[model samples]
Target: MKIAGIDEAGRGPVIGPMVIAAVVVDENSLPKLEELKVRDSKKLTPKRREKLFNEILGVLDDYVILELPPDVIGSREGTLNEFEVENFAKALNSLKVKPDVIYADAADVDEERFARELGERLNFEAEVVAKHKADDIFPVVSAASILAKVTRDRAVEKLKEEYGEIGSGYPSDPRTRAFLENYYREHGEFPPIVRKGWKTLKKIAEKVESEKTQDMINKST
Candidate 1:
């Protein structure tokens, strides 16, 4: 019997891609994952996550990592949850080795519906167990989360090499906020690397406009 796990990383970032990963392992090899103490990527340090990434690959029967670049996510018409479900299904469908059972970290508030939608999109028949925090509960899903995170880190690193210290690529990062502000000021636009219409970027523009209004009111007074 074969078992699989699917998970994603970088969902909330205003920059870069959201990566989805599917990891497959033989049923008997399940113990191997537990032996390595696999868990959610957030709980592990950077170095450890990087180290375990390769180790997890060593134990997998097959794996797939799909990257949905900034433009892809920004341009999608459906809701974010729907977009996630489609891509999750895409990643799973891209897997060469079929599993008898699949575990997923649910992207939607409705776990059962998300699972059903994912199963509906697949080519093969398999039981999909989708739940919140499946990465923490299932070692296979935990392994998939690590792979997704490591892949996104590598991608962000590549972008950093080109863009030079763009911060964590998250809207909340101080560097990211300043980067967007300066980029818009200098270029008359936000870099194409950012997801358009994000509230964080909108806030920056609003702040500048408010300051202009303040200056105009002072002159009138």
Candidate 2:
């Protein structure tokens, strides 16, 4: 039986694009992946995941990545919890490849709703399995996880090259938050990669501006 695993990376980052990857594998080759202890990308070290990622490429029949840039993704209104989540799945479903079953890591409240929305978007019928930790449950999904993660990590590296250090692209990272404040003060606009729509970005902007304004008042007084 032909099976495909779908997973995403860089979903929470305020910088860089979101990568949704799908990896297809046949039943015969599935055991090889399992033997490699391919569970979830988050559970493995970067070195270990990179090794397995390369190993899986030789065994995978096919794969695709749907890259969502920050500009459009950032401009979207409303919570990313539903619309962006559905769009990611739809992007995968619209792909030319079709497998007997597809395992997707669910990021929404209703996994079934996500599956139903995906089915409506796709041209053909295929089994869509949505779960919270599909990457851990399915070895094929684990492979996709590694692929997506590596791709996202490379993207972050490139951003760092152009914009200087921004840490891990996550607002939670002190380096990232510090970079945002400094960047805003220097340029007056958020960089191309930062998700301007994120609350984290807005809060950071407000805080930085407030500090700047207070400094001006203090100096004048």
Candidate 3:
């Protein structure tokens, strides 16, 4: 039976695009992937991921990658989880060969619900399995995870080349917050790559407005 795995990277990053990848291979290819010692992307170093990513692509029957930019994800029309569901559906539909089964790393809290919704978006019949951390447990999903991560990492590098260093793009990263702060002070807005509608940007905008209001009040006094 042909099997496919789907996973995403950059879901939480306040910068850069979110990438979803799908890798399809026959049952016979499973042992080859297993021999590569594939695991979740998080557990692998950048060098290791780069190595296995090439190997997986060389062996897989087919693969699909979808990149959702910050603007689309930051749009108020839908939540990030909703965007993920749609993109995951898009990635699955883009596959050249249909698999007997697909394993997706769940994007929502209810894995079964995610699986059901993903199934609804498909044009063809295939068993959809959704689980938290399926990438760690399933070799095919691990390959998909590596591809997604490596792609996103290259994307971040391009952004850095265009906009200079901007940390890892996560809100929790102090350097990212610092970049936003300094950039806003100079440009009076964020860089084009930033998710303007993110809560982090909203909070920063509020602080700037409040500071301006205080300055005005002091001048009037």
**lDDT for each residue of candidate 3 in 1-221, tens digit (9 for 90 to 100):** 89999999998999999999999999998998888888644777788789888989988999998888888888847766777888899999999998889999985569999999999999889999999989888999988988999999989989989888899999999988888887887788888898767899988766765655534446565
Residue range with the least summed lDDT across 10 consecutive positions in model 2: 212-221
Report lDDT (Cα) of residue 144, candidate 2.
87
Q: Could you tell me every candidate's TM-score relative to the true structure?
A: 0.91, 0.87, 0.92
For candidate 2, the C-alpha RMSD (Å) to the true structure equals 3.0
Candidate 2: tens digits of C-alpha lDDT, residues 1-221: 77888888888888888888888888789998888777745777777777878988898888887778887677776667665566656656665657778777887458897767665665666788878877788888888888999888878888889999999988789999999889988888788887767898888888877865434446565
lDDT of 1 at 190: 76
Q: Identify the candidate with maximal TM-score.
A: 3
Ranked candidates (TM-score, high to low): 3, 1, 2
The runs of at least 3 residues in candidate 3 whose Cα sits more than 4 Å from the true structure, single-residue gaps closed, are: 208-221
Give a tens-digit lDDT track for model 1, residues 1-221.
89999999999989889999999999999999999988645777777889989888898999999988888898899999989999988888998999989999996578999899999999998999999989989999999999998899898899889878889889889998888777777666678788776788788776655544534446565
On a 0 to 100 scale, what is the lDDT of residue 220 in model 2? 62
lDDT of 3: 0.87
* Model 2, CA-based lDDT: 0.79
